[PDB]
Amino acid sequence: EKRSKENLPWVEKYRPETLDEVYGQNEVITTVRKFVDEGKLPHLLFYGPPGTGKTSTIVALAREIYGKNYSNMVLELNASDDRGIDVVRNQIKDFASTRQIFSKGFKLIILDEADAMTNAAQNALRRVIERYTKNTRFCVLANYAHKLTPALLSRCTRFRFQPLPQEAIERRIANVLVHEKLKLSPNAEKALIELSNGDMRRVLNVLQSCKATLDNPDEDEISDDVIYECCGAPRPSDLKAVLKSILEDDWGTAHYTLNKVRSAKGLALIDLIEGIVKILEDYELQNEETRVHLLTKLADIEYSISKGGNDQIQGSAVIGAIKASFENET
Template sequence: MLSNKKPSEDNLPWVEKYRPQTLVELVSHKEITSTIERFINEGRVPHLLFYGPPGTGKTSTILACARKLYGDNWRSMVMELNASDERGIDVVREQIKNYAGTRKMFNSGFKLIILDEADAMTQQAQNALRRVMEKYTKNVRFCIICNYVSKIIPALQSRCTRFRFSPIEQDQVKSRLDYIIQNEKVNITNDGISALLKLSGGDMRRALNVLQACHSAYDFINESVVYECTGNPEPKDVEYIVNTMSKDEFSLAYSNINKMRIERGFALQDILTELFKYFLNNRDFSANSRVYLLDKFSQIEYRLGTGGSEKFQLMSLLGSYKIAIGMARNENEMDLE
């Protein structure tokens, strides 16, 4: 026998369950939301281009705008497309053009087309979209959402009012986390919250996903649990890596780090990210040696991103570190002379 009970919100990912429904509920980028709210109140909404890192509120902002524009029936006036899935010119010529070219009966004003992850659209599709935006401005407004604005052709950028969504401030992420922790009765320590904030890097979506994953897997959440759940090296692991690179000779240091990497399941990319944070403001190294080391980090990261072997890149990382130590030592000796 089938139950008539409605699906519970408890089954929803917290990212969706706690997604802000109105512009007032958004915890960050108040200058952007206030500007857009003024556009809506004055009835002069332009085409919009939202860009910035993931998890900074771009999609939540435009959905809140849609609710303010159209009320409870906003879905009938909004077309959402994820351009990373449907990114070819046929989508622009068929779905988008057909939707933009028709007017809704008994509804005044314009419809809204949201193109998420638009930086994945092909050049042909973007060029076709430029003409559609010009031709159907009376019927429709576009909101183009992307992570990398450089991948959007200048012709589209010039037709939109651009807003950059920067990473969310830690205190703003924390205020939202505190509300969810209290609402979901999450048993988490202060160092666990600090680890969440550190790993999220201003990405609200990542913070909520990690928090929900930890809550599902553990009854008690602390710093170690957060790092274990995400697979990131803990601060004590980073200290161990730095110590063995500094004190042990090359082959032993390589063996120690590689053993830890395999046993703990760390990706070299994650180790590199944590080392970057460690050395960025480390005053034990001279400015020149830090510049050299950080430059080498960027080269290793690029090679890892293009399919380079983790073993060879670990050797490169270790060799670069040894050279940086030598540079710092030579500079100190010259200063003493």
């Protein structure tokens, strides 16, 4: 790096350095702290969605076990480096077989993003794990468990990282605002919670971009308007207005309202579709067929949007799908 901190993104500037700074996964942190305090650390497997604090947790755990110089005491392998079966046969075998060069403790092997590892490498890793388990522990971080062999899943204790709740995001946001002397309105906080979707990294990126959005970073408070303008997300009022126009008015009014809402602030159609879907899941639909029609048609529309095409045709298709599905109600 260069120029120390303050030149880093807030994703990397606020990486936890202690296991007490990892919010959300209270059960996982307490269990691993009990594991390291009692002197029994099994072969861990951290599973969960991105941004939930897996590599941060394992880095803080290794730092707690060893100290500041954990980087030289731990063999960390990731999909960035080559991880063929030659690597498993030489580097992992030598690191597991040999004694510690800097201390008198056990060896820790961190297989970061190990879901991108070949089948034969995992097959060798099974025997490597079983053979040298007396003085070497393996930690496997993965986002998808279907890419791991069943025997590797059997050999490793599974810890699931649940998406970050309300309290954890609020606490981290409060810490960041305290550090940066930044202000933020509570409704903006709820908007950021909604935009998080269990991802702390999205929260940090949006906070950085919104601090850059304000004309003066001091003595101006972040509002929900700033969050929605910087992120480009549709406001709940806009989604409610679009849905009301579609569900209550004729085609001309609905089309005009959707076009006006999209062109007022440059709203994306996929964001509107996601918001409309989230609103419609709370509806008390009378028929079992309205849900089927809505879900299938909107999935087809969002797939076509992902493949790209004409936005006007897709918007009219959204309006028509919603109206036709709700025509089955009565």
